[PDB]
Amino acid sequence: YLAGIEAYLAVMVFALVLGWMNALYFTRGLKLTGTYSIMIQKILFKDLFRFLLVYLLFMIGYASALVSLLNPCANVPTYPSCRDSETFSTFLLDLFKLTIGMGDLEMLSSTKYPVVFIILLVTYIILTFVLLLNMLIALMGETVGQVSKESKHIWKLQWATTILDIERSFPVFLRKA
Amino acid sequence: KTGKIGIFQHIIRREVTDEDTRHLSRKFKDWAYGPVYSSLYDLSSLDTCGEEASVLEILVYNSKIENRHEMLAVEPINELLRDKWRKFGAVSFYINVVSYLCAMVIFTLTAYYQPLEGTPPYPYRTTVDYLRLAGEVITLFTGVLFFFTNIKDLFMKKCPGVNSLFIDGSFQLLYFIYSVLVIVSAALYLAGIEAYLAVMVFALVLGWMNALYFTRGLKLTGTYSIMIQKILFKDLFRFLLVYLLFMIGYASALVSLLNPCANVPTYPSCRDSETFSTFLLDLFKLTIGMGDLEMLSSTKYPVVFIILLVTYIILTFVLLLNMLIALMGETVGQVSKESKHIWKLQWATTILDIERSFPVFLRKAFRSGEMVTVGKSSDGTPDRRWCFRVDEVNWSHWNQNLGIINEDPGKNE
Amino acid sequence: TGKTCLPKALLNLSNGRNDTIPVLLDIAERTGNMREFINSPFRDIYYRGQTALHIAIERRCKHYVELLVAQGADVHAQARGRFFQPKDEGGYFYFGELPLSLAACTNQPHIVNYLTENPHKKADMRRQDSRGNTVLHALVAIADNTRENTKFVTKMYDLLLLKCARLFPDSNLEAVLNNDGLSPLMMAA
Ligand SMILES: CCCCCC/C=C/CCCCCCCC(=O)O[C@H](COC(=O)CCCCCCCCCCC/C=C\CCCCCCCC)COP(=O)(O)OCC[N+](C)(C)C
Ligand SMILES: CCCCCC/C=C\CCCCCCCC(=O)O[C@H](COC(=O)CCCCCCCCCCC/C=C/CCCCCCCC)COP(=O)(O)OCC[N+](C)(C)C
Ligand SMILES: CCCCCC/C=C\CCCCCCCC(=O)O[C@H](COC(=O)CCCCCCCCCCC/C=C/CCCCCCCC)COP(=O)(O)OCC[N+](C)(C)C
Ligand SMILES: CCCCCC/C=C\CCCCCCCC(=O)O[C@H](COC(=O)CCCCCCCCCCC/C=C\CCCCCCCC)COP(=O)(O)OCC[N+](C)(C)C
Ligand SMILES: CCCCCC/C=C\CCCCCCCC(=O)O[C@H](COC(=O)CCCCCCCCCCC/C=C\CCCCCCCC)COP(=O)(O)OCC[N+](C)(C)C
Ligand SMILES: CCCCCC/C=C\CCCCCCCC(=O)O[C@H](COC(=O)CCCCCCCCCCC/C=C\CCCCCCCC)COP(=O)(O)OCC[N+](C)(C)C
Ligand SMILES: CCCCCC/C=C\CCCCCCCC(=O)O[C@H](COC(=O)CCCCCCCCCCC/C=C\CCCCCCCC)COP(=O)(O)OCC[N+](C)(C)C
Ligand SMILES: CCCCCC/C=C\CCCCCCCC(=O)O[C@H](COC(=O)CCCCCCCCCCC/C=C\CCCCCCCC)COP(=O)(O)OCC[N+](C)(C)C
Ligand code: NA
Ligand code: NA
Ligand code: NA
């Protein structure tokens, strides 16, 4: 913003979202919310990274498989029927929308083999929304029942580390008061 | 081979004290300074690099799966496999993974740059099309490679209760499929038929789903890829059964209410000749949530139509697909302990396969052990056994003065 | 190493009795050496400082600890070897470095009394090893949070700082810091 480059914003926009997500730091003053912000961080480890791994295998697999069926636009200007140069990119997003539910199949006749296309989408929808994203819910239940006792113990350290940091920041005559 | 733990344990930790029969021992006490001692196991039959038949290849390949995890979770076996993983089992496995992922990148790029005009697009005539040909030749190698390796397995290790066997029983089956489709697609791409693609497209998706094979190098992801396979059995096939009964029932019931197009050209109001087909998909979308009711007045009885959709939506999204979530929770709490035990077999089977693929001089270079003069064999002949140390601590068993081979405690390096 | 007759006897101990140690020290006297023979430490980089007395207690033989001390051998020799080093450097068993700290860290009370209350040269509890760690610093080191370990750690812990008060009536031994700046309580934490 002082060197003249105009991408001060984009970097600034990531900072903004961290900082509000760094307000979860201050959930230590209550066992409720402090136990909450550490399960979020445990269900983000022994949980939704394992999911991101396989989900990127199922997704690259199908996204490469289904765009392989769409015919190029050299064949001609219209993308949403055809394939050219950003097909993969937009098509991953349409597959990311499908697993979570806020998409529409938008079934396509432009492909060369149309029936095999829908055999693959329905397997994506079964093996990602009905099988994985619901198993993703079930693994959390196996987590939050196990890391609950740990989570009450980690908060007691968080909470204690908070106090001794405040105390340590005082002068000695004020600590001694 | 028969799954007898209680005696299998007792043999491997056989401490005999009377020196006339100490040679009938397999746990020794190399040294003991105070409350810390080093126990020294006999790997005479367990870890034989090549030449002899081994206890460890028997537990891991041809044994009873109901007790392998308890037979591999005893004295040195578990320590012995970790001692193989850090040497070569880790590394070579993580070369197997990158080589496979690349091969699937290489198989990805061809299909994306595979043309779609005319006869099967033989003519290359450019550099990029020769780069693609490098991807198809490297590909077909992978197919025939996974073909031969699985057929020699059919003459050798193979055929447990396949695909209900979470120790590479299923993946052997799937790499074999992937091996076929790359041979079929290459046959039709060379026979002139233009459906090389459709077969090739199923191969691509298997192979990325066959990269779940390589989730064994971590307890996290390996425990993950076997729950997927258990929640696909004691879970979402039961669902597919009833869900196909509720669905055929309603799909036949609701299309029975729509009036034919002989009555006239417009489907989305009317019924003709693909009504059922498209209408199943609209009902598949409803249960999962990414559909719209798209309520229809074209039917002859419109009110009874919505009485049935709302029962589909209650008995499939609110009742079954949410019960489907709840049964998983009953699964993943029960098959977690099994899943940590199956990984230990997967992980072990991975090591012994890599080890078995080495020549004997290289296995004999990555030996897990050491020659030790453990005693005299009553002829003056010193017993030079290849053994394995285990430091151990006990603040209660103070009289450790039985079999102290090395009077000088420490390993004195 | 530097091993001698007198260690070799105690390593090769027959049911708590090797009849040679009363003999060799008689012959050691008639040529003449007791404060050079018994004391002779292993000059290795791995058993450094270890003596016959460090061996007489780890074998759990009380009868000769009286004998080795009867001639006034040593009760503050420091076993600084890489073996006598914690399990954070490349060692196995850190008891401190002293024979008193050894007997306390091996659940052997009677010598811990003896090396304090004997006729001859006494082992005081204030003596620091090469890291400042006294006997109580050491009991915090060998301790684990099991059941049988915490039993005799607390007993031999108690036994000494009570015994430090009936002996030198001054600063408690638990106040004695070390060469990191810590006390036995701050060392346990
Ligand atoms: C010594 C302890 C080391 C401890 C520290 C950690 C060291 C790690 C090194 C890891 C080496 C292994 C990785 C190399 C690539 C590899 O092994 O790739 C393998 C196969 O590769 C080969 O066949 C190539 C033959 C040469 C390989 C060894 C080269 C390294 C040698 C140097 C290491 C040091 C020791 C000896 C050198 C010789 C001199 C005598 C030493 C003593 C002193 C002189 C991939 O598996 P794949 O078959 O695809 O999977 C099986 C398939 N299935 C059965 C599951 C279906
Ligand atoms: C270790 C921390 C350090 C980070 C290193 C990166 C730092 C700096 C990179 C910025 C320089 C690059 C841009 C310069 C060129 C440029 O100008 O490029 C622009 C476009 O560039 C961009 O958009 C740059 C996007 C930057 C974001 C990077 C990631 C930031 C950090 C990410 C991590 C934090 C995540 C948080 C998210 C929350 C979720 C997770 C929370 C955690 C889990 C809960 C071109 O367009 P134009 O308009 O023409 O530009 C003007 C040019 N002109 C015409 C004036 C010459
Ligand atoms: C045991 C393995 C062996 C499999 C056996 C099947 C092998 C080969 C069949 C291929 C020949 C048939 C086509 C020839 C006729 C033809 O050409 O037919 C086409 C259309 O035909 C097709 O599209 C055929 C679809 C093939 C897919 C079959 C299933 C493949 C295997 C399925 C299993 C694996 C699943 C994986 C999915 C992942 C999820 C689950 C993972 C597991 C759970 C996690 C007609 O159109 P046209 O353009 O005119 O064609 C050109 C004709 N012309 C004009 C040149 C004369
Ligand atoms: C250890 C593995 C390392 C391997 C990394 C290799 C990755 C990339 C290098 C190769 C890409 C080079 C760029 C391609 C050429 C290009 O520029 O293509 C552009 C298009 O954009 C692309 O194609 C790039 C998107 C991706 C493409 C598929 C590859 C997918 C890569 C996925 C990597 C997966 C990693 C990991 C798996 C996931 C799990 C986690 C891992 C395990 C645990 C940590 C130009 O298109 P256009 O000209 O319009 O073509 C039209 C052609 N028409 C119409 C004439 C026929
Ligand atoms: C294990 C998962 C993977 C299984 C894959 C193996 C099964 C099938 C793949 C092969 C299908 C090949 C279809 C034919 C080739 C093709 O595409 O031909 C097209 C047209 O096709 C058709 O007319 C085929 C009629 C519809 C029936 C489809 C198959 C059966 C459907 C039911 C599948 C059920 C199982 C599975 C689905 C549920 C999965 C969830 C489970 C859990 C997953 C883990 C070529 O156009 P053209 O003839 O030129 O156009 C028409 C003629 N006109 C008028 C233009 C001249
Ligand atoms: C310190 C160690 C020193 C050694 C260094 C490495 C030395 C040599 C490397 C040799 C590479 C090739 C080895 C192949 C091993 C093999 O045959 O692997 C197979 C996997 O299938 C293949 O490979 C396909 C065959 C075609 C080759 C791959 C594609 C073409 C070559 C690509 C190489 C480029 C790499 C990487 C470039 C990108 C780099 C990103 C780094 C990033 C680091 C983080 C093992 O399957 P299997 O075990 O049998 O399990 C299968 C399942 N079943 C049957 C047991 C049930
Ligand atoms: C052990 C049981 C074995 C029984 C299998 C019998 C199956 C099929 C044989 C009969 C079908 C013959 C073809 C029909 C005629 C035809 O060609 O009809 C076509 C249309 O397409 C169809 O009708 C075929 C789609 C399905 C139709 C309903 C049957 C549903 C079958 C479901 C099977 C369920 C299995 C299992 C239950 C699920 C649970 C798992 C099991 C238990 C555990 C493993 C022509 O229509 P169009 O000319 O347009 O007519 C218009 C008429 N208009 C407008 C003039 C009035
Ligand atoms: C156990 C589950 C199954 C229960 C089924 C039994 C209950 C009802 C079925 C019978 C309904 C018959 C309706 C009348 C016939 C018909 O359809 O007449 C049509 C029109 O209709 C009407 O005007 C009926 C008014 C609306 C009230 C509907 C019923 C009551 C609704 C509430 C239902 C609540 C219970 C259940 C629903 C919730 C279920 C979730 C629980 C859990 C499941 C497991 C004929 O057109 P026309 O008169 O010519 O057109 C109007 C006249 N004009 C202007 C054109 C001349
Ligand atoms: Na739940
Ligand atoms: Na939804
Ligand atoms: Na929705």
Residue numbers in the entry:
A (entry chain A): 567 to 641, 654 to 755
B (entry chain D): 379 to 641, 654 to 803
C (entry chain A): 190 to 378
Structure paper excerpt:
Transient receptor potential (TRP) channel TRPV4 is a polymodal cellular sensor that responds to moderate heat, cell swelling, shear stress, and small-molecule ligands. Transient receptor potential (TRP) channel TRPV4 is a non-selective cation channel that is ubiquitously expressed in most tissues, including bone, skin, vasculature, heart, brain, lungs, liver, kidneys, and bladder. The channel is activated by warm temperatures (>27 °C), an increase of cell volume, endogenous ligands such as derivatives of arachidonic acid, and synthetic compounds.
First, we determined the structure of hTRPV4 in the apo state by subjecting the purified protein to single-particle cryo-EM in the absence of added ligands. The corresponding 3D reconstruction resulted in a 3.0-Å resolution structure. The hTRPV4apo structure represents a tetramer assembled of four identical subunits, with the overall architecture reminiscent of other TRPV channels, which includes two main compartments: a transmembrane domain (TMD) with a central ion channel pore and an intracellular skirt where four subunits comprise walls enclosing a wide cavity underneath the ion channel. Upon inspection, the cryo-EM map of hTRPV4apo revealed numerous non-protein densities around the TMD that represented annular lipids. A closer look at the ion channel pore in hTRPV4apo revealed two constriction points, in the upper pore or the selectivity filter and at the lower pore or the gate region, typical for the tetrameric ion channels. The selectivity filter constriction is formed by the backbone carbonyl oxygens of glycines G679, with the cross-pore distance of 6.6 Å between the diagonal pairs, permissive for conductance of hydrated sodium or potassium ions. The narrowest point of the gate region is formed by isoleucines I715. With the 10.2 Å distance between the Cα atoms of the diagonally positioned I715, the side chains of these isoleucines face the center of the pore, likely forming a tight hydrophobic seal and making the pore impermeable to water or ions. Confirming the closed conformation of the ion channel pore in hTRPV4apo, measurements of the pore radius show that at the level of I715 it is smaller than the radius of the water molecule. Interestingly, in this non-conducting apo state of hTRPV4, the pore-forming S6 helices contain a π-bulge, signifying the region undergoing an α-to-π transition in S6 during gating in other TRP channels.
